[PDB]
Ligand binder design. Structure first.
Ligand SMILES: Cc1cc2nc3c(=O)[nH]c(=O)nc-3n(C[C@H](O)[C@H](O)[C@H](O)COP(=O)(O)O)c2cc1C
Ligand SMILES: Cc1cc2nc3c(=O)[nH]c(=O)nc-3n(C[C@H](O)[C@H](O)[C@H](O)COP(=O)(O)O)c2cc1C
Ligand SMILES: CN(C)c1ccc(/N=N/c2ccccc2C(=O)O)cc1
Ligand SMILES: CN(C)c1ccc(/N=N/c2ccccc2C(=O)O)cc1
Lengths: 193, 203
């Protein structure tokens, strides 16, 4: 009933991954007029990469002692993770760029995987529970999905699963458009989610 | 042998991936006093992500007709691939960040895979062809955990160096060597450092 929608393509109207995701979102809203949708742009807008300053603050041995400056370094991070915590369903839209994802999406992941917040260690455990994710991806070529010619070259959505998995999001569904099929699948998913 | 060194860690002095690679570069420099080493920072310095404008320009159907504005959108990219074209050996230093590479390195890749420049295609479904020849790559990586290497427990989770191979390979760089330090982290590091000294003396 609460959705965080992460859009990774730098394109606007011409983005296919973005359009497909919004088709899901509109469908889902009709089925649940009560639902909140929060949108997080990581494609058309620059998302800062993790810096050395970020590392120092994020892996501080005594976080309660972080200075004001260090909290500033982690402010966007906190905002990004909060959005996640507040969501029930995470929708990520993304193209396949060079066998992986656009750099902004990688940076988003880099901001949201946080020691003591989304994962812990003692061995690593995940901290997020109750969430599912839907990944809408668009590829220019073909054969990157399960059983495909090029499956092994796919470091986009399969990498996302690993990273989402690390933090606890293990119920993930992937809808891909390569080369109307996906749109229909997305509508069906919107009706039953 | 001209070298291009791409450093992807955001850390400086404390970066292990950077240190290990600098070890290799100094060693190589002792052996080849006349060799040229270019360095490209993608970790401690922000590197623009691909924009819509970059897509419009890089895949414009009639490249000769690109406006000055469009060319400006491709200027950094031209500079970046130029560094690659001028090199015989590419050294990439990178840590594993969330099962992949830091975002800056991803952005560097996104800037260098260029239609009609580092790859091209022909039609059947597009058939791709790499345009880079005679180059090798050395990837020096560092990891906090363990088991991400071949035969490792967590091998299938590795989308860092295995992804880089795939992408470098698409543009023509298929002689690629990976030197990794995991986790006795000092041991993995001393080992990696010995492997690099060896590789410097024979390249
Ligand atoms: C920077 C760049 C890199 C791309 N890399 C790949 C690729 O590795 N594999 C592929 O199948 N398509 C690739 N494509 C094609 C895109 O995946 C395709 O256009 C996709 O539909 C873009 O998503 P969008 O329409 O939401 O922007 C690439 C396109 C661009 C602009
Ligand atoms: C943002 C962040 C993400 C990381 N993600 C991983 C990871 O997925 N797997 C891993 O084994 N280590 C991970 N680490 C640990 C680093 O890979 C390790 O500290 C590495 O040696 C860093 O490289 P450097 O010393 O060149 O900066 C991460 C560290 C940071 C700060
Ligand atoms: C790495 N590979 C294999 C690639 C790289 C680029 C690519 N096309 N890019 C595009 C650019 C602009 C419009 C449409 C496409 C399109 O959807 O094809 C396809 C495959
Ligand atoms: C996701 N995984 C698997 C991780 C994430 C982070 C991690 N440590 N990061 C570090 C941060 C700062 C200094 C040293 C380390 C260090 O080298 O341990 C180890 C494994």
């Amino acid at each position: 009933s609460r959705i965080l929608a992460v859009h990774a393509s730098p394109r606007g109207e011409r983005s296919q991954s973005r359009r497909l995701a919004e088709v899901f979102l509109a469908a889902y809203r009709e089925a649940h007029p009560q639902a909140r949708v929060a949108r997080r742009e990581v494609g058309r807008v620059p998302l800062p990469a993790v810096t050395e300053a970020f590392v120092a603050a994020a892996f501080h041995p005594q976080p309660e002692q972080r200075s004001l400056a260090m909290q500033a370094d982690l402010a966007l991070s906190d905002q990004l993770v909060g959005e996640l915590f507040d969501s029930d369903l995470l929708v990520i839209s993304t193209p396949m760029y060079n066998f992986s994802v656009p750099s902004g999406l990688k940076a988003w992941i880099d901001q949201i995987v946080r020691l003591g917040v989304t994962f812990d260690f003692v061995q690593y455990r995940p901290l997020l529970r109750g969430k599912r994710a839907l990944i809408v991806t668009s590829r220019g070529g073909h054969g990157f999905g399960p059983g495909g010619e090029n499956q092994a070259m796919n470091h986009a959505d399969p990498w996302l699963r690993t990273a989402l998995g690390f933090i606890g999001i293990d119920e993930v569904t992937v809808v891909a458009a390569e080369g109307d099929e996906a749109e229909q699948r997305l509508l069906a998913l919107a009706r039953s989610a």
